Amino acid sequence: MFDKITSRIQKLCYGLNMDFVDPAQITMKVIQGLYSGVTTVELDTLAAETAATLTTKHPDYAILAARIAVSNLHKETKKVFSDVMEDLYNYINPHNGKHSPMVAKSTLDIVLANKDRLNSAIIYDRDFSYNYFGFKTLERSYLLKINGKVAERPQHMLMRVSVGIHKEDIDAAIETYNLLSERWFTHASPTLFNAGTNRPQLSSCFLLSMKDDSIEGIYDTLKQCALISKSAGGIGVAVSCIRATGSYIAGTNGNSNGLVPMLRVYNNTARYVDQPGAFAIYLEPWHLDIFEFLDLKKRDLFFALWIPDLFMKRVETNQDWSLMCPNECPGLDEVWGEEFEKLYASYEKQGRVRKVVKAQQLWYAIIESQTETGTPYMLYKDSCNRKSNQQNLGTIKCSNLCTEIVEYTSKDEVAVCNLASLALNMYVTSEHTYDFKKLAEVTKVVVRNLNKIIDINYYPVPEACLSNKRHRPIGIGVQGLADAFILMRYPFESAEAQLLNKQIFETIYYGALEASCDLAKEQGPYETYEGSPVSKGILQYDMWNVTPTDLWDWKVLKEKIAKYGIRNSLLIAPMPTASTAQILGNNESIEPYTSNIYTRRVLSGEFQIVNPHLLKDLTERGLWHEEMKNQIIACNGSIQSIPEIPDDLKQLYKTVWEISQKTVLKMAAERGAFIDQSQSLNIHIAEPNYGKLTSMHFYGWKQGLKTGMYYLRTR
Amino acid sequence: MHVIKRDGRQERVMFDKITSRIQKLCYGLNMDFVDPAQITMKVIQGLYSGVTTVELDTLAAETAATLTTKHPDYAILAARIAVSNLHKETKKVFSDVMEDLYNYINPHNGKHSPMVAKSTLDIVLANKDRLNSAIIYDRDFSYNYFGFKTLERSYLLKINGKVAERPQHMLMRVSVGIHKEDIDAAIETYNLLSERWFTHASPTLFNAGTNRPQLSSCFLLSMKDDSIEGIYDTLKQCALISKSAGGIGVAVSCIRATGSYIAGTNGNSNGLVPMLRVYNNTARYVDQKRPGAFAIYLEPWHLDIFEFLDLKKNTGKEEQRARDLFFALWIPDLFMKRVETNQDWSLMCPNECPGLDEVWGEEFEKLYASYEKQGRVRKVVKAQQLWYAIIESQTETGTPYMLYKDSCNRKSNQQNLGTIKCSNLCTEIVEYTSKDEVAVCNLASLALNMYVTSEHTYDFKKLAEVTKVVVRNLNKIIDINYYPVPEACLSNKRHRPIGIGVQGLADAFILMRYPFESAEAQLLNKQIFETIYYGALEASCDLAKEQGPYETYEGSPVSKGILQYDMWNVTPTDLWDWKVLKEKIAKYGIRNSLLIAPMPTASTAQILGNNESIEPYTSNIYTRRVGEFQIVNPHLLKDLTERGLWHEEMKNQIIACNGSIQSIPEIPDDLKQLYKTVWEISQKTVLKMAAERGAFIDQSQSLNIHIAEPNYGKLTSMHFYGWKQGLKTGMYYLRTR
Numbered sequence A: 001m002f003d004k005i006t007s008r009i010q011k012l013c014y015g016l017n018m019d020f021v022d023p024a025q026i027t028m029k030v031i032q033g034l035y036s037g038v039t040t041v042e043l044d045t046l047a048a049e050t051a052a053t054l055t056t057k058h059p060d061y062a063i064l065a066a067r068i069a070v071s072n073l074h075k076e077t078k079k080v081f082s083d084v085m086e087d088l089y090n091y092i093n094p095h096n097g098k099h100s101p102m103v104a105k106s107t108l109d110i111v112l113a114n115k116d117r118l119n120s121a122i123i124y125d126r127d128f129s130y131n132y133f134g135f136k137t138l139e140r141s142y143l144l145k146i147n148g149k150v151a152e153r154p155q156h157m158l159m160r161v162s163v164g165i166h167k168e169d170i171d172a173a174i175e176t177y178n179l180l181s182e183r184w185f186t187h188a189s190p191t192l193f194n195a196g197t198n199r200p201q202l203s204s205c206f207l208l209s210m211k212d213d214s215i216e217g218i219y220d221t222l223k224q225c226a227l228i229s230k231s232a233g234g235i236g237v238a239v240s241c242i243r244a245t246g247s248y249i250a251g252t253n254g255n256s257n258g259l260v261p262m263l264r265v266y267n268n269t270a271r272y273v274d275q276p277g278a279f280a281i282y283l284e285p286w287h288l289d290i291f292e293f294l295d296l297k298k299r300d301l302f303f304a305l306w307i308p309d310l311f312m313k314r315v316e317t318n319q320d321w322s323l324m325c326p327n328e329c330p331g332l333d334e335v336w337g338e339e340f341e342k343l344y345a346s347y348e349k350q351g352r353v354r355k356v357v358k359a360q361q362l363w364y365a366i367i368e369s370q371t372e373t374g375t376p377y378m379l380y381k382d383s384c385n386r387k388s389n390q391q392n393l394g395t396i397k398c399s400n401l402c403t404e405i406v407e408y409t410s411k412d413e414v415a416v417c418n419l420a421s422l423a424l425n426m427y428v429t430s431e432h433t434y435d436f437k438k439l440a441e442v443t444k445v446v447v448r449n450l451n452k453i454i455d456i457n458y459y460p461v462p463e464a465c466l467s468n469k470r471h472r473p474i475g476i477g478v479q480g481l482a483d484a485f486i487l488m489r490y491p492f493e494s495a496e497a498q499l500l501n502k503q504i505f506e507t508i509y510y511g512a513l514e515a516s517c518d519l520a521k522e523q524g525p526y527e528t529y530e531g532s533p534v535s536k537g538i539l540q541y542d543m544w545n546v547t548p549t550d551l552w553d554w555k556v557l558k559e560k561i562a563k564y565g566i567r568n569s570l571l572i573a574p575m576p577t578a579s580t581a582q583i584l585g586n587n588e589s590i591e592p593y594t595s596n597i598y599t600r601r602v603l604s605g606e607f608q609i610v611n612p613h614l615l616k617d618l619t620e621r622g623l624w625h626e627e628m629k630n631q632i633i634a635c636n637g638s639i640q641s642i643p644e645i646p647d648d649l650k651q652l653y654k655t656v657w658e659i660s661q662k663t664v665l666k667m668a669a670e671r672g673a674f675i676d677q678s679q680s681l682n683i684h685i686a687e688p689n690y691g692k693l694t695s696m697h698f699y700g701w702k703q704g705l706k707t708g709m710y711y712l713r714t715r
Numbered sequence B: 001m002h003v004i005k006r007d008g009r010q011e012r013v014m015f016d017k018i019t020s021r022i023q024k025l026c027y028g029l030n031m032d033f034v035d036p037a038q039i040t041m042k043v044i045q046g047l048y049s050g051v052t053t054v055e056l057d058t059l060a061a062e063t064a065a066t067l068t069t070k071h072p073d074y075a076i077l078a079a080r081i082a083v084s085n086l087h088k089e090t091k092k093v094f095s096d097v098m099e100d101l102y103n104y105i106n107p108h109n110g111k112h113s114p115m116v117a118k119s120t121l122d123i124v125l126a127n128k129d130r131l132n133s134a135i136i137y138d139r140d141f142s143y144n145y146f147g148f149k150t151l152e153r154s155y156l157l158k159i160n161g162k163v164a165e166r167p168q169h170m171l172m173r174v175s176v177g178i179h180k181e182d183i184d185a186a187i188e189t190y191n192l193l194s195e196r197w198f199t200h201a202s203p204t205l206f207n208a209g210t211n212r213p214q215l216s217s218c219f220l221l222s223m224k225d226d227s228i229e230g231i232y233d234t235l236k237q238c239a240l241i242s243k244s245a246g247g248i249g250v251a252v253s254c255i256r257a258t259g260s261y262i263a264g265t266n267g268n269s270n271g272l273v274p275m276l277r278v279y280n281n282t283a284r285y286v287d288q289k290r291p292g293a294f295a296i297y298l299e300p301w302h303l304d305i306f307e308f309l310d311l312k313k314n315t316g317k318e319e320q321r322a323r324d325l326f327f328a329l330w331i332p333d334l335f336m337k338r339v340e341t342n343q344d345w346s347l348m349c350p351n352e353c354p355g356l357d358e359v360w361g362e363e364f365e366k367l368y369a370s371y372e373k374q375g376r377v378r379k380v381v382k383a384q385q386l387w388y389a390i391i392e393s394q395t396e397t398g399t400p401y402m403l404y405k406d407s408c409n410r411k412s413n414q415q416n417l418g419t420i421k422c423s424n425l426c427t428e429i430v431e432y433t434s435k436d437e438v439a440v441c442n443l444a445s446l447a448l449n450m451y452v453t454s455e456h457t458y459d460f461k462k463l464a465e466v467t468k469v470v471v472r473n474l475n476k477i478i479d480i481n482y483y484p485v486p487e488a489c490l491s492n493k494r495h496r497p498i499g500i501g502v503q504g505l506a507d508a509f510i511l512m513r514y515p516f517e518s519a520e521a522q523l524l525n526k527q528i529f530e531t532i533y534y535g536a537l538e539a540s541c542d543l544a545k546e547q548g549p550y551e552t553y554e555g556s557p558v559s560k561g562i563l564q565y566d567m568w569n570v571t572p573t574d575l576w577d578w579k580v581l582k583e584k585i586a587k588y589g590i591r592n593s594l595l596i597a598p599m600p601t602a603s604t605a606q607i608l609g610n611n612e613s614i615e616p617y618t619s620n621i622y623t624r625r626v627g628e629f630q631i632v633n634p635h636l637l638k639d640l641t642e643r644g645l646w647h648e649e650m651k652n653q654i655i656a657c658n659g660s661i662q663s664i665p666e667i668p669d670d671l672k673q674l675y676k677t678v679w680e681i682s683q684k685t686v687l688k689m690a691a692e693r694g695a696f697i698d699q700s701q702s703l704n705i706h707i708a709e710p711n712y713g714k715l716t717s718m719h720f721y722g723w724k725q726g727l728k729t730g731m732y733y734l735r736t737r
């Protein structure tokens, strides 16, 4: 009897490690929610659930689990792509009666005029390549649904995005289709949510100079934020030009209440417009309201600092910092580095300061905020501007929400970003050699994609659109760096890892540029190209004084770029990639495993998950048991103190806490020479003291990092 | 013992010189109850040796005012002492003070900051001659201590602490500020202000003849529409107007309901409540020591009304509160009919049910029904339920104000423009607003007790002439005001509305010796307001001749010879020939769509010494805080002191009685009659009187209701009464106790 269930679980067991997967186990839990009443479709989830719990015994359960629920999706959705599309278009909302197409006619009509070539391109066996928690992610949000029931299979949705990008160009579409569905990279969420629809808001982040220091200013800027958040976008906002508390107002002959009351207005605007807000506010440490600033998360806004070098210099030489009001001392954010230290001091040597503190004391109020709340983020204004390819445009006033994007912004330019990410774990061949020829190749495609995205994209406000058209900046990231190192057999901190880290990024960048060049050959450079460091032969690694390894002939590439230029002001920026890395079963971005154990909620409750790579070594060596697992939870996810585990692995699966943050910082410093934008650097300090922190910032600062620190994590 | 004189010159104490100086300022005062040796005695104890001769003026004017409780003359005397001080501390010649104020260099910020406009100076200056000798400083001695200290606290200009302006220099600046090179009229206005016949609204008082003049107090807005973009555009406007110290009232009914579908995002609308948080947050943050004030107007067919209703509570949950906005209801006739006949009432989304707010009266009644019929409703409730909800809101908070859309639109001369979607912060202004037009209003009030004579007869003929003047002034303001936003300016030049108000109405009855509630008082109330409407139309007519109609005149009720009182079916008394005027208009047209708008004269009433607006006394005994002082109704005290009926315990037995004189066995009834508090008076009678005067007020009236012990019965009956009277504003605040 339960035999009829088992022999059916078994069907989807192909290629799985049957030392550790045992279908009999599931059946024993499933056969009990059985009765004369419901049957198969119900029991289908039942088993998927059960299987999914069992992930703790073996990673293959996640995959088995996945497969079952997938089988069941297929058993309840249309096969033919064009036919699924047809339904999404037609959907009359039978609620009111008005027609509401879920895809866009043009994408429909493109799809139908090639129903032949697109339909038979889709390989639906590719829906089994996702793990459970990955699949469930898609099913919650990424797969389009008519009234309850999901319509799109994951292939459908990929094909949709693909043609949603390459429109009339089928070839480019089917090659993007493949790449994606084999999980060689991914687009940003907005792209996957929106490509092929009526509101194709694909970009994924915006930046924003505060238009002007008046009510009129503050409220136009506010109108804009509301508008971007409407159509999804995250925002960075440059706020430093707003006059401080006490600063006189001529028009009303009153006295301004300063930056904070104004940050309340914005906060409140984020609680409103949603589809929760998310603004990063960037303040410069010379602003007279910087102290109140540091108490605010100490609320729907994240604070970040636009640090000028001068400030770091003064802090380390126990010194005199002078807080100014931007009304009283104009243009202080319109300038960086040299011209800043001249202009700033000029105001100091002119008396015109509102209040002097010791540099060191401000510093320590920062360390206080970070230990409390994990914020403010630390970004170095001078580093960012010095190594920016957009420096010919002016002074770069701030960054995006996750500190990775560094772009110019003005009264009439609001910077945007279009992002995507390469799955580094996919390029390590089954020989523990890393395939770079293939990595470069895929980047070049991602560039063409992102580049196409600029023109088709829906822009929420006009100067988002004006910005992006002038400088055509893109942003390309990575995920699974950690899994790459593990699949290679490399302790994250090993010299072996440390080289690979450079090499990977020498490659991503080589390809990006090379592809950006071919596009410039094809359609000319972006119009604010000539004037920039690349018209001058100075690529990103030069600005760092790094000479790359002989892996690629940059000699040859520079001669190309000298001939036809590039298409995009900027290209690379490794980002958090939180939501996508969940689908692909990867560790987020460039960071180690925070723990070797963690959970994940899925509708009702959670599932307990051990590091997939890890569990596979412990079980094969027959070291996996009850209390074995129960102990690692006791050690917050480390295995260092568990006695019967080899030397080999204790090294291989060190958690981020057990890793040297100095080393982490140094490694970013390395790769960051081939990242033309910035990177989202979290810092993990187990037991913090103000000492450890202070050298951290200082170490990373000395390394010359564009972003010093995204989040500080403490416990 | 000695006193330091006005020059550092030690002078021994000589207490007769105090009494002597006081006596010098008792011209015209009834000396039988004003013993000025009483102050002397009370001064020379609160008095150490070496104290400044200037402090023996403050200490003395302070003492003098705490004796209002003996004879109101004392309160006038207390001022006289403070003014006889100020004059000594001030430059006499007007044109000199104007020089200082301009040439004033900011002693902190080394740069320069005029306090008058260059033009205002260059006029005053090139007109030194006439203007200087025009001013009568013997008018500064005609206020009482309380009016005076309000003036002193914000209405005269301070050069670095030191009050530069004398009250006449102020009055004068304002006149030139309105009249520029028109020196004949500046002087005529100065005379009518300084003789206390009327007062301009505070924003005019403040800014008149300064640079970038914010002369107007009130602004009306309609939301820009169901959009994140509309919302934030209307918010920038509100911010911009609030920075210019302007009061605001807003039409918010078009906004999607909590739940309503949002196309572009597939998500769903969070409703009015969340948006109103954003409006509170902005009101808090933009200013004018004073936070901006928005009145929010909702129509009772909107799905979010119940939430709208608990938002003013100080009891509930932090997330759904907004104690900084003021809530109002724009009420269709239908809702009221539905209530008194226990029928159901449907709540809609303006998204699934467009056009509701852009249409009134039967046009509405038709459109609303055909939605109900169509099943276009999100929730359907018993009408009485909503009405119960409304009246506990009022019981707990005193809000929402109660406006009747159908009255306002039916009886408005802006009718030819479209639907009037809301009123203002104070509910007396009834003007049109659109995507392109924010209605400003410019206001002033007449001191209604100035026009009653020694022989207890009223001077309507004079009241009509003063009104004419005001209209000419309020008109010029429109052309000199600096508009916070362009749509404000658009509107005002298009329809040139003006709102003329009143203060000292209850004072007017008392001088004649009328109870508020008599046939006498109730005839005069009609007659007075006829007079104001008559005089004002006649003024606007003259201007039309001089200049042309207001652009949007043609097709209006007036351009058809329909005057406000026509819209009520009320024949005026025979006091004035309304057919002569009607003939005069159909000739030249008028210059201002709207004219009369009885607003609540909050602080200009404190100055002129008058009782607020259209209202009877709240008490015969009260407080004004400046030490806070113990004023007895000046009128009452006179009749008591005259009839030799005033002492310590009587003053007290009234405080015992919450300022009522009713129970006191020693007072003639015809006095107990005249001096009833508002908590004695019939509110129905109040509502009838407004309605009765309402036929002559082309806008509305801020109208509080006082009900002592309030229940559902009393609150309900009171609204419905006024409603059936044809009132546009049926209730401003509900005050209780």
Ligand SMILES: Nc1ncnc2c1ncn2[C@H]1C[C@H](O)[C@@H](COP(=O)(O)OP(=O)(O)OP(=O)(O)O)O1
Pocket: B003, B004, B005, B006, B007, B011, B012, B013, B014, B015, B017, B018, B021, B022, B053, B054, B056, B057, B060, B088
């Ligand atoms: N010798 C005195 N003894 C008591 N009170 C005095 C004396 N001199 C003046 N005062 C009081 C009377 C008034 O209430 C108050 C202000 O009167 P005022 O005559 O303006 O002061 P003053 O005498 O210092 O100046 P002035 O030089 O103009 O006379 O001072």
Ligand SMILES: Cc1cn([C@H]2C[C@H](O)[C@@H](COP(=O)(O)OP(=O)(O)OP(=O)(O)O)O2)c(=O)[nH]c1=O
Pocket: A213, A214, A215, A216, A218, A242, A243, A248, A249, A250, A251, A252, A256, A257, A258, B242, B243, B244, B285, B286, B287, B288
């Ligand atoms: C008027 C006003 C301004 N502000 C703020 C907003 C701005 O940051 C700052 C003044 O900017 P503005 O609003 O532009 O004031 P202004 O142009 O009339 O005066 P000035 O030219 O001297 O700057 O103060 C308030 O917080 N509350 C207010 O009521």
Ligand SMILES: Cc1cn([C@H]2C[C@H](O)[C@@H](COP(=O)(O)OP(=O)(O)OP(=O)(O)O)O2)c(=O)[nH]c1=O
Pocket: A229, A230, A231, A272, A273, A274, A275, B225, B226, B227, B228, B229, B255, B256, B261, B262, B263, B264, B265, B268, B269, B270, B271
């Ligand atoms: C987009 C968005 C709209 N809204 C509300 C506010 C507005 O009253 C209402 C109108 O939506 P809009 O802001 O105009 O968005 P839309 O253009 O998609 O609207 P429409 O469906 O008419 O095309 O939606 C939010 O509260 N939060 C949001 O994030």
Ligand SMILES: [Mg+2]
Pocket: A213, A214
């Ligand atoms: Mg300004």
Ligand SMILES: [Mg+2]
Pocket: B226, B227
């Ligand atoms: Mg819309």
